[PDB]
Amino acid sequence: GFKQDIATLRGDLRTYAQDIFLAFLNKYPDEKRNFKNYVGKSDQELKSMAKFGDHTEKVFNLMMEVADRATDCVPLASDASTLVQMKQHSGLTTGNFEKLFVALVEYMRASGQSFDSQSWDRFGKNLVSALSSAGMK
Numbered sequence: 001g002f003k004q005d006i007a008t009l010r011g012d013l014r015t016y017a018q019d020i021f022l023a024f025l026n027k028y029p030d031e032k033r034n035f036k037n038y039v040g041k042s043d044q045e046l047k048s049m050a051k052f053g054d055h056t057e058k059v060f061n062l063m064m065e066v067a068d069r070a071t072d073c074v075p076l077a078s079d080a081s082t083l084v085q086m087k088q089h090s091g092l093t094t095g096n097f098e099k100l101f102v103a104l105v106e107y108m109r110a111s112g113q114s115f116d117s118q119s120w121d122r123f124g125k126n127l128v129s130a131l132s133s134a135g136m137k
């Protein structure tokens with residue numbers, strides 16, 4: 001289920017973080033408005049760029065912590081607050097997060113692995129709800 005999936009992702013996190021983030025940027029190319037230095041680069045070129053690997057892994061490090069601290073795929077209000085208040089998220093609206101979780105769920109469905117994709121879907125929905133409650137537009 002969801003908790004096992006956190007363990008699975010954490011066992012190969014730099015690879016999963018990069019591959020899921022690439023799935024997001026390729027599904028929603030307009031999202032590079034937020035990631036100007038990733039423009040004009042193939043997947044293999046991005047997987048060579050230091051901030052790409054470093055930043056995406058740190059994003060997924062925190063995402064797995066938020067998922068692990070959740071109960072029944074509902075994140076802590078403290079975690080939602082942190083994600084809204086972060087200066088690096090100043091630009092953002094809940095639709096940016098919705099898209100990331102659409103890509104993550106479609107990645108998991110496309111995988112051979114017994115990921116609990118319905119739980120990740122609910123998690124993404126519940127995190128968007130919590131971000132809206134915590135003041136994200």
Ligand code: HEM
Nearest residue numbers: 031034035054055058059060062063088089092096097100
């Ligand atoms: C649960 C989802 C997310 C988590 C846990 C998260 C977490 C983080 C973390 C930890 C950083 C700092 C990275 C670093 O400086 O090394 C960061 C930076 C950033 N995040 Fe998020 N983030 C999430 C979703 C998003 C989404 C959906 C967007 C935009 C579509 C976004 C845009 C950014 C940007 C622009 C930065 C700073 C610039 C950059 O690192 O490229 N984040 N995020």
Ligand SMILES: Cc1ccccc1O
Nearest residue numbers: 021051052055056059
């Ligand atoms: C902030 C961020 C998130 C996911 C992948 C790369 C990246 O720079």
